[PDB]
Amino acid sequence: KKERDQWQVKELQDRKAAEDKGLDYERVRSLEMSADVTEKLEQKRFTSY
Amino acid sequence: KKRSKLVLPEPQISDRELEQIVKIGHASDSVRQYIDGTATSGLLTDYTESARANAVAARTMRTPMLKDT
Amino acid sequence: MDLDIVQREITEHLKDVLHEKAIDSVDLAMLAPKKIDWDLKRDIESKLQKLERRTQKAVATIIRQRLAE
Amino acid sequence: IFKYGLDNLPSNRTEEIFKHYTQHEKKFGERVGIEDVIISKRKTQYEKMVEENGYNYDAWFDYLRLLENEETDREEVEDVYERAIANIPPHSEKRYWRRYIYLWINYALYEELVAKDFDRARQVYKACIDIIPHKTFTFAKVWIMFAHFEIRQLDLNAARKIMGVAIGKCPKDKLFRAYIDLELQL
Amino acid sequence: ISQFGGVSELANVWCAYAEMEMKHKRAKAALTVMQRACVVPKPGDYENMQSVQARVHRSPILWAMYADYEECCGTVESCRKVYDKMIELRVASPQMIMNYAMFLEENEYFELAFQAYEKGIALFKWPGVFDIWNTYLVKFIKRYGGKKLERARDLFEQCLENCPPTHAKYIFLLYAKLEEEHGLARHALSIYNRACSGVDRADMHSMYNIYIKKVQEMYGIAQCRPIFERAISELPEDKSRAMSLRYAQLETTVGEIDRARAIYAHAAEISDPKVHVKFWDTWKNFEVAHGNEATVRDMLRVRRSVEASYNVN
Numbered sequence: 001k002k003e004r005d006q007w008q009v010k011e012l013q014d015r016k017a018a019e020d021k022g023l024d025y026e027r028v029r030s031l032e033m034s035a036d037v038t039e040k041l042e043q044k045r046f047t048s049y
Numbered sequence: 050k051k052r053s054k055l056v057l058p059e060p061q062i063s064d065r066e067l068e069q070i071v072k073i074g075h076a077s078d079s080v081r082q083y084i085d086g087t088a089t090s091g092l093l094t095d096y097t098e099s100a101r102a103n104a105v106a107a108r109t110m111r112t113p114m115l116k117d118t
Numbered sequence: 119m120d121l122d123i124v125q126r127e128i129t130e131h132l133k134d135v136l137h138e139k140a141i142d143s144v145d146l147a148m149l150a151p152k153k154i155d156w157d158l159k160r161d162i163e164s165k166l167q168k169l170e171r172r173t174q175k176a177v178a179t180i181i182r183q184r185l186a187e
Numbered sequence: 188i189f190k191y192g193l194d195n196l197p198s199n200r201t202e203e204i205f206k207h208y209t210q211h212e213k214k215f216g217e218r219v220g221i222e223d224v225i226i227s228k229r230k231t232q233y234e235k236m237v238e239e240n241g242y243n244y245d246a247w248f249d250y251l252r253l254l255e256n257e258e259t260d261r262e263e264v265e266d267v268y269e270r271a272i273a274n275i276p277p278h279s280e281k282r283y284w285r286r287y288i289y290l291w292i293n294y295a296l297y298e299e300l301v302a303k304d305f306d307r308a309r310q311v312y313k314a315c316i317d318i319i320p321h322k323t324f325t326f327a328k329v330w331i332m333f334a335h336f337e338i339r340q341l342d343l344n345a346a347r348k349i350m351g352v353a354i355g356k357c358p359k360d361k362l363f364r365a366y367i368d369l370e371l372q373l
Numbered sequence: 374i375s376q377f378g379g380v381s382e383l384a385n386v387w388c389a390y391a392e393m394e395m396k397h398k399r400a401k402a403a404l405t406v407m408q409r410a411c412v413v414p415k416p417g418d419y420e421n422m423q424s425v426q427a428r429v430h431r432s433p434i435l436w437a438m439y440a441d442y443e444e445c446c447g448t449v450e451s452c453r454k455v456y457d458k459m460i461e462l463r464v465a466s467p468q469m470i471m472n473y474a475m476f477l478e479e480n481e482y483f484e485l486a487f488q489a490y491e492k493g494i495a496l497f498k499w500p501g502v503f504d505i506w507n508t509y510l511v512k513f514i515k516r517y518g519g520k521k522l523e524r525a526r527d528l529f530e531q532c533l534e535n536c537p538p539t540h541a542k543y544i545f546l547l548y549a550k551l552e553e554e555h556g557l558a559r560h561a562l563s564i565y566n567r568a569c570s571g572v573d574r575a576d577m578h579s580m581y582n583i584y585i586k587k588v589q590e591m592y593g594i595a596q597c598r599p600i601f602e603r604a605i606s607e608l609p610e611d612k613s614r615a616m617s618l619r620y621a622q623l624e625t626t627v628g629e630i631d632r633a634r635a636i637y638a639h640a641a642e643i644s645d646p647k648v649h650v651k652f653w654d655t656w657k658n659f660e661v662a663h664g665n666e667a668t669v670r671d672m673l674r675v676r677r678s679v680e681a682s683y684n685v686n
């Protein structure tokens with residue numbers, strides 16, 4: 001649970017910090033992560049019997 | 050929800066008519082601003098401002114009534 | 119991060135062009151402030167001025183040989 | 188593989204080969220290669236949008252400018268001008284010619300300044316006057332330029348003939364003004 | 374050689390090794406550690422290719438540390454090898470792609486800086502590429518201006534060929550600025566004609582009024598007419614009223630009073646007089662000024678029809 005919470009608080013305070021800076025967190029977040037992180041995210045996101 | 054198509058009557062001053070108007074206007078404007086003078090300039094009118102005065106006088110216009118009913 | 123650098127360059131659009139209120143005036147310039155040749159005429163000028171300078175140089179030789187007799 | 192594709196397929200296909208070639212070369216190539224493929228793409232692109240319409244004069248003015256800017260061979264720049272010129276406006280009204288006529292003027296300017304073949308440049312200017320209707324409207328532009336082109340090469344006896352016929356066929360105020368100004372300068 | 378709980382734990386050990394060597398000025402050893410850390414395993418190099426030591430070379434922390442030492446202590450060509458390999462492996466973040474281009478640009482390798490941006494765009498999918506395209510397109514213009522314009526066009530077209538409509542607003546205005554100051558006039562206008570349909574509905578009016586202003590600024594209010602009629606037919610009803618008021622103001626200030634009515638009469642069916650009272654005021658002022666007894670009765674007729682479009686409910 002703690003480990004799970006560490007990612008949660010990390011992203012949330014980073015969002016807060018990004019929001020405090022007046023920057024779109026999602027752009028700033030995507031600036032840091034590798035393309036592999038995007039690729040797993042892009043994978044995750046009646047014509048006939 | 051739904052809206053009609055915008056339909057407008059054809060302009061009275063067509064584009065080809067306006068071309069002639071601006072041709073005359075630019076010539077008449079140019080020959081005014083071409084030249085001034087120290088005493089004999091009072092023969093000239095300041096045409097462009099008088100044209101503005103004439104245009105605002107002509108700006109009141111109305112559609113006619115009583116042709117039928 | 120300088121997360122908006124493109125906005126520094128397009129500012130002249132954002133301030134005066136991205137919004138405008140209204141106008142209620144007319145004049146012979148406002149009816150036609152440029153003419154449809156203008157960009158083609160613009161891109162000829164840097165070439166056509168070379169012809170102009172050559173024309174002054176050419177006409178000077180025509181005169182010089184016509185007065186040499 | 189990309190070059191083999193472009194060499195062996197008609198350019199109505201190859202748009203995928205081109206866009207991917209100008210991806211591959213645009214990363215893994217180098218400047219002289221990157222610009223070469225983008226020019227060949229653009230020439231193909233203009234050539235397409237010319238075939239789509241012909242009267243897309245702005246496609247010609249770009250295409251002519253591109254070929255002139257890249258210093259391409261005279262025969263090919265001259266040929267494409269001839270294709271431009273065949274798009275005579277289907278109208279007797281000067282409004283539609285006002286944009287068109289700079290194809291002729293630029294062709295003469297190219298022939299006089301860049302090719303430096305003044306006999307060919309004369310043929311360009313002459314062919315303008317055989318195309319303009321003159322009775323319904325005239326361009327003083329071409330008559331003034333053709334007159335001054337014969338003031339260059341020191342042939343005022345031709346320039347006077349050209350400009351006097353302009354007065355003869357079509358008295359127009361800029362034609363008088365420009366001829367008078369020429370005779371003052373002489 | 375030992376076990377760890379995860380890649381990030383091990384990567385910190387590699388960094389801590391090079392870190393101490395760098396502080397002790399063993400810069401060539403520090404690079405050697407990073408080279409030895411970052412070497413991609415061949416498929417036989419480990420007992421399994423999913424062990425922590427076999428995956429640690431994918432950690433971006435490790436490559437970031439390596440590339441930074443090469444910038445500080447290596448040759449320019451060696452830095453390109455590090456960054457290019459980092460791009461090859463998908464490791465490079467958009468930020469450190471922009472660091473790579475900054476490095477080449479700072480060393481005046483401007484043309485290689487554009488290849489760095491170019492493969493940045495090949496890796497990432499929107500919106501991730503958005504700040505790569507931003508820095509690329511402003512730097513290219515600042516480097517070359519009009520001297521490479523047909524290549525500049527290909528960047529903007531390549532950008533806008535996949536740009537979404539929430540981000541495209543700035544790119545269209547940046548692209549129009551290029552074509553405005555160096556290009557042919559109809560090209561800039563064609564960008565605006567694209568912009569007022571490629572930008573999303575919530576800001577599409579802010580693209581129409583640009584196109585209105587720029588056409589009006591050069592071809593005047595006569596040629597401006599057709600692009601008002603596109604606007605009125607297309608932007609959402611609150612702005613379609615606003616365009617109708619502005620369009621009617623032009624046709625009255627010109628003197629096409631009959632066209633002015635048809636603008637109002639066309640807007641009046643999407644303008645509830647019980648709430649939009651300022652519209653009906655502007656039309657009422659118009660019809661008492663430029664109208665007559667017959668057309669005022671027609672204004673009041675349509676007013677009492679459109680209120681009856683709601684009160685019966």
Ligand SMILES: O=P(O)(O)O[C@H]1[C@H](OP(=O)(O)O)[C@@H](OP(=O)(O)O)[C@H](OP(=O)(O)O)[C@@H](OP(=O)(O)O)[C@H]1OP(=O)(O)O
Pocket residue numbers: 072153155325326327328359360361
């Ligand atoms: O013949 P004018 O009454 O003297 O007018 C001419 C003429 O205008 P139009 O023939 O269109 O009526 C020129 O047109 P061209 O004969 O060269 O086709 C035009 O040149 P543009 O078409 O390039 O505008 C020129 O204007 P400008 O003085 O700016 O060269 C203008 O001359 P004036 O202004 O001296 O009357």
